[PDB]
RNA sequence: AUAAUAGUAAAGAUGAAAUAAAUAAUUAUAAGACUAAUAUAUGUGAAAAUAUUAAUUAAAUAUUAACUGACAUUGAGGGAUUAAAACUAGAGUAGCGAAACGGAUUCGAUACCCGUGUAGUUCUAGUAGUAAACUAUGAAUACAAUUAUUUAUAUAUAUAUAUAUAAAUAAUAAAUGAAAAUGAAAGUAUUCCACCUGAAGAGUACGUUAGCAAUAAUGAAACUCAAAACAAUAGACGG
């Protein structure tokens, strides 16, 4: 999964995509598609 | 080529095998492979091996482990004897039968994924089937699967958001299902454990295959009686059936409904006298033993 | 019973071993020759299964 | 590997069948075909066994005794047997292929004909015929094979056997079906023969019999049908009978010299 | 009598098969001479692959390893690697000084 | 053992002794060695290739051939420590021979452990004279065996019918099993129809281990009898 | 990994009092026996009469009964025979 | 065995194969040939040949080896000194005159004759292993000698080495079989060339 | 060792002996020294040394990556460390134990054995720099035929073995050697240092330097002799 996991205990790939803009250019992705 | 030769050669047919020639644990089927010579040859002494085999073995059967040693000799026991087992299980015609009703391991049957709805049980059985595994390169299991993993985590992170985007975003209950199963789909291509070493079906005992009927001249035969002996004077502690020696096999014999007297008789040297059994069912289990039940007929 | 603990813990050795003092040098000697020996006997034991082994089959 | 022998004047057996008995085509199947069906099978059921290097003859000795290895008994039994079939009905044993020979008057001889009237209380040859076409009719309801056989005691009698059954080890000459009723009387030569088997001291539990065969007829479908047809194997063991060359039956009895 | 020792009688086990050797003495003598504590493997946490040096807190696991008085004992009877050996009796003598074994 | 110079050169000795005339007639032997030469080099000889696998022995893969990263990510610049030991020994030491129908036999007779004890006879007939087509299985002159599969499985990977060798494997596999169940039901039906005919046999396989059973079990009970009573005695003190 | 110790060269491999088994004569034991039986139902007890019985038949010609009284060991025949063969020697 | 293996066979080896050491064939079937055309040679020019072999078994090959090359063989055991001491060991026993048919002229023999040592002018040696005395005896007495070479033999000590199994008595009695047929051809061919 | 407790009449020692409310048992207290098994000094350390536990500080391994670019080897003089004994000063002193005084043994016994036991053995701060300080074998580099056994790293998989490459040890080929033997050196070569030139006199004398001292280092000659020494062989002899 990776930045898209679900573990409480997770990695750096979330702290990185969150730095990175891929977290919220993934939430407004999604949300785009689901619209 | 020689080296094309030798690999086809008769002593390269035999796989390679250094399990102890004395094994005194629990026995369930054979180990080694039984050497056999023709008589005029074993006149001269020859078997096929490197060197002549000392002329004192009067057997034409034999097992061995090397070829030659730092010793000088030949690593032989001049034993054949699992071939009689066999052959002694042949003449019983009881065919072995799955308890589990589960298909012929010998035959190409047509299956579906009935059981492949377990991908997490078994998916994960390569990491956590390594009960006897070493506490370092098991442990190897976890950085190098890591990366191959962690290889795939672009491809599952766009079919995820292409396939499932809901569950992203209301629950894992499900992402975790489509993680199971993509492993598996991209792991079908690989090769882990392509090759599998357990046992298949009866590896080999019989090739009988059920229900045909035994003809005899007095009609056809009903109930199998073969003779046996009795171990134990004593029921099995904590089971309620004996253990008899039939044709090389040891069973669990169920009574009637008494046990013949003459047990309390002979008492320890009760394996001193032959009974007739009846071969109820024979079935195969996991560690390629056979569990042959049987029946103390007595004369009635 | 009571025996075979005092031998197999070697009572009865160190008790007799502390009577005496010994140099440092000398029980290193012994220490070093006593092991020599025992190993020596596990070889001899060892060759001594393949001479019976070898004549069980007919060499 | 097990070959089919080559037989004498094999040219002229493979474009007249033989004379009086077979056609080409009856020849083909009983010999050329069977044999290498036979052959054949023993060769798949022995290569990597000890008896692969023993002829027919003696797989079935060694094998008479072994029950899981009747197949093999069977095929030895049958290869033995067909040989014996094909070398007293063949024209000549000698190879006249450049000599060009058509004049083969083989007769049974004074010590065969001795013997006959010895062993079967006067009767002549051709009687003795009658009774052996007969023995055939009423034994052999299936395959099997008919044979004049002599004992240990210089008698010739005759024995059938039902499919591979040996002459020489009377525990499996087969001469009974079980699958019909049998009388009393039958059933105790099974008996007694089951009680001599048993006073065996051998391991092996095997027996002494110097049965040997004189004549020898194949009764199985490969010999008969395509030339004579089902029903007619009376007719088949008459021509047989007939045309039997005595070169080697009068050289199959012992004289001693 | 109808009795006989437990070592003069060998007790096949169900689902093996066996020789009639297995019925004579030569087998009970030979089942004796290699007659081996070949499962402790599978028992012996110190040959699994863990440090012996983690359980200097634990007696129970390491008086396995001491005799009846708490000598410890040799390599040639508890079968370890050297580096486990020595790892194990430094456990040993650390629990010894601390006040647990 | 030092290499010996006498046994190679009794000619020149010899020659030695009749131009001075201590021997005085030339022996047997004398003209047929001289037209023979015995070898005399005694060398060790390299190696540049493992005959079974046809792996290259003594080439060195230059850096100049890696120029793509590892495994780990990293490129290759110089030399490691084991480019720069010299491998002369690997030129003289007899190559392991390897073949990949090993690795298949020893899969088999771990899938089908029984089959081991089917006597194998390892005393060769003539190498020379197998003439085997192995587009099926059976052949004439061997027998079925686990050595059959495995040499079907190689003609399958040979000819590329199958990609894999655990497809071609499993095929041979199943026609393994086809012909031995074909053998399995001729020996019981011959058995059967045998029987029916009037074939009496004296002792069967079961009947054969009852009796060596017994004979082992009369002697243990010998000296069970008398273990049980020299305990007795010496007990007693 | 059961560590294999190698001897050195050696003038000799010979056991110094090889161990032999010998077996216990059957007139001593039905002796133990009976005096056992004695001892317990008393001395001419009926239930004896068995032992005594066997004792004198044991004991009637010799009273250590007819027996094999010779057993040698072979070890150190075989031990000199098979030593250069087996002690893994490197070639000269 | 790889662990019994004398290095100075190095150049004969195939390959390691199940624990153990593979002899060339190539270079077994050359130095065979080579072997083979040494005994033919001695056999037609009317040399002694004497087949050695001393391991169990080897009698029955060795006998036949002999008889149909007219030669000698000894298969119990080699009695050190038979060629350097031979007046002290063969001198005793009987020798005789043959002409070139090798038929017994019959000519009774001097005693001058009778005590002269006889000695091979060819020795073949099955088993060079156990057989150093015999070697080393030729080498002194300038005997070619042909023997079997396995992994483990010395090669220098023949003057005709035959690289090949020396424990199986089907490999022993092949190799030997093939020389005492060349032999054979030998002694055929002197023979003839006297007919003619 | 001291005290208590009940309990007693011998205890302790030796080849046998004799010299100096106990001994034994159960408690309590004090003191000094030592470190059972594991254990192979395996390993570690330059050597000397180093094995009850923990902690702090310092040093030490393999592979890979990058970097420096011959910066190396050896090493006169010099420097540092260096067992046991010994010495200086101050503490300590259970046990052991030169000496001394006694008891025995013996023809005698300045001994071996026993008792009482001082210096010493322990710690702190120093002096001194000597041992069969030994592998009786200086250090470095290149190289040469095998096996076995461990260890380490790596590789693979049908997962627990298998395959590799080093190190250690054992037995060897070759080679070397007076041989015993050495065996990766006591082999094949190269480089640097130390040292030797018949025995005895002598590691002495004298001088010098250093030390609180004992001493340590350096280190001769005359006279006399045709000896003297090593390995191995066959004997003889051995409480
Ligand atoms: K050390
Ligand atoms: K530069
Ligand atoms: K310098
Ligand atoms: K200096
Ligand atoms: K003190
Ligand atoms: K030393
Ligand atoms: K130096
Ligand atoms: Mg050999
Ligand atoms: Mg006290
Ligand atoms: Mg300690
Ligand atoms: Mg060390
Ligand atoms: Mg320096
Ligand atoms: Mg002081
Ligand atoms: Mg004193
Ligand atoms: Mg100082
Ligand atoms: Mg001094
Ligand atoms: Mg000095
Ligand atoms: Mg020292
Ligand atoms: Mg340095
Ligand atoms: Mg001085
Ligand atoms: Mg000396």
Same mark, same amino acid.
């Given at each position: 999964?990776?930045?898209?996991?679900?573990?409480?205990?997770?990695?750096?790939?979330?702290?990185?995509?969150?730095?990175?803009?891929?977290?919220?250019?993934?939430?407004?992705?999604?949300?785009?598609?689901?619209? | 080529?020689?080296?094309?030769?030798?690999?086809?050669?008769?002593?390269?047919?035999?796989?390679?095998?250094?399990?102890?020639?004395?094994?005194?644990?629990?026995?369930?089927?054979?180990?080694?492979?039984?050497?056999?010579?023709?008589?005029?040859?074993?006149?001269?002494?020859?078997?096929?091996?490197?060197?002549?085999?000392?002329?004192?073995?009067?057997?034409?059967?034999?097992?061995?482990?090397?070829?030659?040693?730092?010793?000088?000799?030949?690593?032989?026991?001049?034993?054949?004897?699992?071939?009689?087992?066999?052959?002694?299980?042949?003449?019983?015609?009881?065919?072995?039968?799955?308890?589990?009703?589960?298909?012929?391991?010998?035959?190409?049957?047509?299956?579906?994924?009935?059981?492949?709805?377990?991908?997490?049980?078994?998916?994960?059985?390569?990491?956590?089937?390594?009960?006897?595994?070493?506490?370092?390169?098991?442990?190897?299991?976890?950085?190098?699967?890591?990366?191959?993993?962690?290889?795939?985590?672009?491809?599952?992170?766009?079919?995820?958001?292409?396939?499932?985007?809901?569950?992203?975003?209301?629950?894992?209950?499900?992402?975790?299902?489509?993680?199971?199963?993509?492993?598996?789909?991209?792991?079908?291509?690989?090769?882990?454990?392509?090759?599998?070493?357990?046992?298949?079906?009866?590896?080999?005992?019989?090739?009988?295959?059920?229900?045909?009927?035994?003809?005899?001249?007095?009609?056809?035969?009903?109930?199998?009686?073969?003779?046996?002996?009795?171990?134990?004077?004593?029921?099995?502690?904590?089971?309620?059936?004996?253990?008899?020696?039939?044709?090389?096999?040891?069973?669990?014999?169920?009574?009637?409904?008494?046990?013949?007297?003459?047990?309390?008789?002979?008492?320890?040297?009760?394996?001193?006298?032959?009974?007739?059994?009846?071969?109820?069912?024979?079935?195969?289990?996991?560690?390629?033993?056979?569990?042959?039940?049987?029946?103390?007929?007595?004369?009635? | 019973?009571?025996?075979?603990?005092?031998?197999?813990?070697?009572?009865?050795?160190?008790?007799?071993?502390?009577?005496?003092?010994?140099?440092?040098?000398?029980?290193?000697?012994?220490?070093?020759?006593?092991?020599?020996?025992?190993?020596?006997?596990?070889?001899?034991?060892?060759?001594?299964?393949?001479?019976?082994?070898?004549?069980?089959?007919?060499? | 590997?097990?070959?089919?022998?080559?037989?004498?004047?094999?040219?002229?057996?493979?474009?007249?069948?033989?004379?009086?008995?077979?056609?080409?085509?009856?020849?083909?199947?009983?010999?050329?075909?069977?044999?290498?069906?036979?052959?054949?099978?023993?060769?798949?059921?022995?290569?990597?066994?000890?008896?692969?290097?023993?002829?027919?003859?003696?797989?079935?000795?060694?094998?008479?005794?072994?029950?899981?290895?009747?197949?093999?008994?069977?095929?030895?039994?049958?290869?033995?047997?067909?040989?014996?079939?094909?070398?007293?009905?063949?024209?000549?044993?000698?190879?006249?292929?450049?000599?060009?020979?058509?004049?083969?008057?083989?007769?049974?001889?004074?010590?065969?004909?001795?013997?006959?009237?010895?062993?079967?209380?006067?009767?002549?040859?051709?009687?003795?015929?009658?009774?052996?076409?007969?023995?055939?009719?009423?034994?052999?309801?299936?395959?099997?094979?008919?044979?004049?056989?002599?004992?240990?005691?210089?008698?010739?009698?005759?024995?059938?056997?039902?499919?591979?059954?040996?002459?020489?080890?009377?525990?499996?000459?087969?001469?009974?079906?079980?699958?019909?009723?049998?009388?009393?009387?039958?059933?105790?030569?099974?008996?007694?023969?089951?009680?001599?088997?048993?006073?065996?001291?051998?391991?092996?539990?095997?027996?002494?019999?110097?049965?040997?065969?004189?004549?020898?007829?194949?009764?199985?479908?490969?010999?008969?049908?395509?030339?004579?047809?089902?029903?007619?194997?009376?007719?088949?063991?008459?021509?047989?009978?007939?045309?039997?060359?005595?070169?080697?039956?009068?050289?199959?009895?012992?004289?001693?010299? | 009598?109808?009795?006989?020792?437990?070592?003069?009688?060998?007790?096949?086990?169900?689902?093996?098969?066996?020789?009639?050797?297995?019925?004579?003495?030569?087998?009970?003598?030979?089942?004796?001479?290699?007659?081996?504590?070949?499962?402790?493997?599978?028992?012996?946490?110190?040959?699994?692959?863990?440090?012996?040096?983690?359980?200097?807190?634990?007696?129970?696991?390491?008086?396995?390893?001491?005799?009846?008085?708490?000598?410890?004992?040799?390599?040639?009877?508890?079968?370890?690697?050297?580096?486990?050996?020595?790892?194990?009796?430094?456990?040993?003598?650390?629990?010894?000084?601390?006040?647990?074994? | 053992?030092?290499?010996?110079?006498?046994?190679?050169?009794?000619?020149?000795?010899?020659?030695?002794?009749?131009?001075?005339?201590?021997?005085?007639?030339?022996?047997?032997?004398?003209?047929?060695?001289?037209?023979?030469?015995?070898?005399?080099?005694?060398?060790?000889?390299?190696?540049?290739?493992?005959?079974?696998?046809?792996?290259?022995?003594?080439?060195?893969?230059?850096?100049?051939?890696?120029?793509?990263?590892?495994?780990?990510?990293?490129?290759?610049?110089?030399?490691?420590?084991?480019?720069?030991?010299?491998?002369?020994?690997?030129?003289?030491?007899?190559?392991?021979?390897?073949?990949?129908?090993?690795?298949?036999?020893?899969?088999?007779?771990?899938?089908?452990?029984?089959?081991?004890?089917?006597?194998?006879?390892?005393?060769?007939?003539?190498?020379?004279?197998?003439?085997?087509?192995?587009?099926?299985?059976?052949?004439?002159?061997?027998?079925?065996?686990?050595?059959?599969?495995?040499?079907?499985?190689?003609?399958?990977?040979?000819?590329?019918?199958?990609?894999?060798?655990?497809?071609?494997?499993?095929?041979?596999?199943?026609?393994?099993?086809?012909?031995?169940?074909?053998?399995?039901?001729?020996?019981?039906?011959?058995?059967?129809?045998?029987?029916?005919?009037?074939?009496?046999?004296?002792?069967?396989?079961?009947?054969?281990?009852?009796?060596?059973?017994?004979?082992?079990?009369?002697?243990?009970?010998?000296?069970?009898?008398?273990?049980?009573?020299?305990?007795?005695?010496?007990?007693?003190? | 990994?059961?560590?294999?110790?190698?001897?050195?060269?050696?003038?000799?491999?010979?056991?110094?009092?090889?161990?032999?088994?010998?077996?216990?004569?059957?007139?001593?034991?039905?002796?133990?026996?009976?005096?056992?039986?004695?001892?317990?139902?008393?001395?001419?007890?009926?239930?004896?009469?068995?032992?005594?019985?066997?004792?004198?038949?044991?004991?009637?010609?010799?009273?250590?009964?007819?027996?094999?009284?010779?057993?040698?060991?072979?070890?150190?025949?075989?031990?000199?025979?098979?030593?250069?063969?087996?002690?893994?020697?490197?070639?000269? | 065995?790889?662990?019994?293996?004398?290095?100075?066979?190095?150049?004969?080896?195939?390959?390691?194969?199940?624990?153990?050491?593979?002899?060339?064939?190539?270079?077994?079937?050359?130095?065979?040939?080579?072997?083979?055309?040494?005994?033919?040679?001695?056999?037609?020019?009317?040399?002694?040949?004497?087949?050695?072999?001393?391991?169990?078994?080897?009698?029955?090959?060795?006998?036949?080896?002999?008889?149909?090359?007219?030669?000698?063989?000894?298969?119990?055991?080699?009695?050190?000194?038979?060629?350097?001491?031979?007046?002290?060991?063969?001198?005793?026993?009987? +020798?005789?005159?043959?002409?070139?048919?090798? $038929? %017994? =002229? !019959?000519?009774?023999?001097?005693?001058? &004759?009778?005590? /002269?040592?006889? +000695?091979?002018?060819?020795?073949?040696?099955? $088993? %060079? =292993? !156990?057989?150093?005395?015999?070697?080393? &005896?030729?080498? /002194?007495?300038?005997?070619?000698?042909?023997?079997?070479?396995?992994?483990?033999? !010395?090669?220098?000590?023949?003057?005709?080495?035959?690289?090949?199994?020396?424990?199986?008595?089907?490999?022993?009695?092949?190799?030997?079989?093939?020389?005492?047929?060349?032999?054979?051809?030998?002694?055929?061919?002197?023979?003839?060339?006297?007919?003619?």
């Amino acid at each position: 999964m990776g930045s898209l996991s679900n573990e409480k205990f997770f990695d750096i790939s979330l702290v990185d995509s969150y730095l990175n803009k891929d977290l919220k250019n993934i939430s407004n992705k999604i949300d785009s598609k689901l619209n | 080529t020689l080296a094309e030769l030798l690999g086809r050669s008769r002593i390269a047919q035999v796989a390679n095998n250094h399990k102890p020639l004395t094994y005194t644990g629990k026995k369930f089927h054979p180990t080694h492979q039984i050497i056999e010579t023709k008589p005029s040859t074993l006149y001269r002494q020859e078997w096929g091996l490197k060197s002549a085999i000392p002329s004192k073995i009067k057997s034409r059967y034999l097992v061995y482990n090397d070829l030659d040693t730092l010793e000088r000799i030949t690593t032989f026991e001049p034993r054949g004897g699992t071939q009689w087992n066999r052959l002694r299980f042949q003449e019983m015609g009881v065919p072995i039968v799955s308890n589990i009703g589960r298909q012929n391991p010998f035959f190409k049957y047509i299956s579906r994924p009935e059981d492949e709805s377990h991908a997490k049980l078994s998916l994960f059985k390569e990491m956590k089937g390594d009960t006897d595994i070493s506490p370092a390169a098991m442990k190897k299991r976890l950085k190098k699967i890591t990366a191959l993993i962690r290889s795939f985590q672009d491809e599952f992170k766009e079919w995820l958001v292409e396939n499932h985007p809901d569950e992203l975003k209301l629950n894992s209950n499900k992402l975790e299902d489509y993680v199971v199963k993509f492993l598996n789909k991209k792991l079908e291509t690989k090769t882990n454990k392509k090759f599998n070493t357990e046992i298949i079906g009866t590896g080999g005992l019989s090739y009988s295959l059920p229900g045909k009927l035994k003809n005899s001249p007095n009609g056809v035969i009903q109930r199998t009686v073969v003779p046996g002996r009795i171990l134990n004077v004593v029921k099995e502690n904590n089971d309620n059936k004996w253990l008899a020696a039939i044709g090389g096999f040891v069973a669990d014999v169920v009574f009637f409904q008494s046990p013949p007297s003459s047990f309390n008789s002979m008492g320890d040297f009760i394996r001193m006298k032959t009974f007739l059994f009846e071969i109820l069912e024979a079935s195969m289990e996991k560690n390629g033993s056979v569990s042959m039940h049987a029946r103390l007929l007595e004369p009635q | 019973r009571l025996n075979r603990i005092m031998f197999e813990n070697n009572i009865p050795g160190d008790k007799r071993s502390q009577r005496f003092y010994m140099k440092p040098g000398k029980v290193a000697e012994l220490k070093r020759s006593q092991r020599h020996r025992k190993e020596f006997m596990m070889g001899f034991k060892r060759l001594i299964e393949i001479v019976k082994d070898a004549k069980r089959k007919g060499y | 590997i097990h070959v089919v022998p080559k037989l004498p004047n094999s040219k002229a057996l493979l474009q007249n069948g033989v004379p009086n008995i077979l056609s080409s085509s009856g020849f083909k199947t009983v010999w050329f075909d069977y044999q290498r069906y036979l052959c054949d099978k023993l060769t798949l059921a022995t290569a990597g066994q000890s008896l692969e290097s023993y002829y027919p003859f003696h797989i079935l000795l060694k094998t008479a005794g072994n029950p899981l290895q009747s197949n093999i008994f069977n095929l030895a039994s049958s290869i033995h047997n067909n040989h014996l079939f094909v070398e007293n009905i063949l024209p000549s044993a000698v190879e006249h292929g450049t000599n060009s020979n058509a004049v083969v008057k083989t007769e049974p001889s004074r010590l065969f004909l001795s013997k006959i009237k010895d062993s079967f209380n006067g009767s002549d040859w051709e009687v003795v015929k009658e009774e052996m076409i007969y023995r055939a009719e009423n034994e052999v309801l299936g395959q099997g094979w008919l044979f004049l056989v002599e004992n240990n005691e210089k008698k010739l009698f005759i024995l059938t056997s039902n499919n591979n059954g040996t002459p020489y080890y009377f525990p499996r000459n087969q001469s009974f079906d079980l699958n019909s009723a049998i009388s009393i009387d039958e059933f105790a030569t099974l008996k007694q023969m089951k009680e001599l088997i048993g006073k065996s001291t051998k391991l092996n539990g095997k027996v002494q019999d110097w049965t040997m065969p004189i004549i020898c007829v194949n009764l199985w479908d490969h010999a008969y049908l395509h030339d004579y047809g089902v029903g007619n194997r009376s007719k088949y063991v008459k021509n047989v009978l007939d045309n039997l060359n005595w070169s080697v039956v009068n050289n199959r009895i012992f004289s001693g010299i | 009598t109808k009795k006989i020792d437990q070592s003069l009688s060998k007790k096949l086990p169900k689902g093996t098969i066996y020789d009639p050797f297995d019925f004579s003495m030569g087998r009970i003598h030979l089942d004796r001479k290699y007659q081996a504590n070949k499962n402790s493997n599978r028992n012996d946490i110190m040959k699994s692959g863990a440090n012996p040096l983690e359980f200097y807190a634990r007696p129970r696991i390491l008086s396995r390893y001491v005799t009846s008085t708490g000598r410890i004992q040799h390599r040639d009877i508890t079968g370890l690697s050297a580096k486990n050996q020595r790892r194990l009796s430094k456990a040993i003598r650390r629990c010894q000084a601390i006040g647990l074994m | 053992m030092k290499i010996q110079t006498n046994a190679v050169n009794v000619l020149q000795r010899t020659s030695a002794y009749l131009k001075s005339g201590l021997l005085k007639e030339t022996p047997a032997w004398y003209n047929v060695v001289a037209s023979i030469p015995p070898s005399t080099k005694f060398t060790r000889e390299p190696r540049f290739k493992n005959p079974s696998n046809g792996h290259i022995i003594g080439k060195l893969v230059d850096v100049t051939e890696q120029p793509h990263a590892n495994n780990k990510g990293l490129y290759k610049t110089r030399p490691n420590s084991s480019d720069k030991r010299v491998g002369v020994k690997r030129l003289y030491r007899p190559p392991k021979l390897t073949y990949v129908e090993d690795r298949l036999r020893s899969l088999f007779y771990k899938q089908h452990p029984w089959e081991l004890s089917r006597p194998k006879i390892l005393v060769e007939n003539e190498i020379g004279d197998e003439n085997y087509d192995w587009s099926h299985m059976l052949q004439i002159g061997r027998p079925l065996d686990g050595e059959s599969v495995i040499q079907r499985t190689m003609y399958l990977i040979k000819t590329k019918q199958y990609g894999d060798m655990v497809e071609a494997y499993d095929h041979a596999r199943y026609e393994f099993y086809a012909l031995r169940m074909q053998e399995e039901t001729e020996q019981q039906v011959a058995l059967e129809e045998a029987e029916m005919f009037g074939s009496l046999f004296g002792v069967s396989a079961i009947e054969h281990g009852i009796q060596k059973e017994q004979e082992v079990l009369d002697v243990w009970e010998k000296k069970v009898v008398e273990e049980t009573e020299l305990m007795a005695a010496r007990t007693s003190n | 990994k059961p560590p294999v110790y190698r001897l050195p060269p050696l003038p000799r491999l010979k056991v110094k009092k090889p161990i032999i088994r010998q077996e216990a004569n059957k007139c001593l034991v039905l002796m133990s026996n009976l005096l056992q039986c004695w001892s317990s139902y008393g001395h001419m007890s009926p239930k004896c009469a068995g032992l005594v019985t066997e004792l004198k038949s044991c004991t009637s010609e010799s009273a250590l009964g007819k027996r094999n009284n010779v057993q040698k060991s072979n070890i150190n025949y075989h031990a000199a025979r098979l030593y250069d063969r087996i002690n893994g020697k490197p070639h000269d | 065995s790889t662990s019994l293996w004398r290095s100075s066979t190095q150049s004969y080896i195939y390959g390691e194969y199940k624990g153990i050491h593979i002899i060339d064939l190539n270079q077994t079937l050359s130095y065979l040939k080579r072997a083979a055309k040494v005994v033919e040679g001695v056999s037609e020019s009317g040399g002694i040949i004497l087949f050695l072999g001393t391991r169990q078994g080897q009698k029955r090959g060795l006998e036949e080896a002999a008889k149909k090359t007219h030669g000698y063989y000894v298969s119990t055991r080699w009695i050190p000194g038979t060629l350097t001491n031979s007046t002290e060991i063969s001198g005793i026993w009987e +020798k005789q005159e043959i002409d070139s048919n090798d $038929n %017994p =002229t !019959e000519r009774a023999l001097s005693p001058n &004759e009778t005590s /002269k040592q006889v +000695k091979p002018d060819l020795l073949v040696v099955l $088993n %060079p =292993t !156990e057989n150093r005395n015999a070697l080393l &005896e030729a080498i /002194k007495s300038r005997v070619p000698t042909i023997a079997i070479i396995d992994t483990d033999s !010395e090669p220098s000590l023949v003057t005709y080495p035959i690289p090949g199994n020396d424990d199986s008595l089907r490999s022993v009695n092949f190799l030997l079989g093939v020389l005492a047929r060349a032999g054979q051809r030998g002694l055929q061919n002197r023979l003839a060339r006297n007919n003619e």
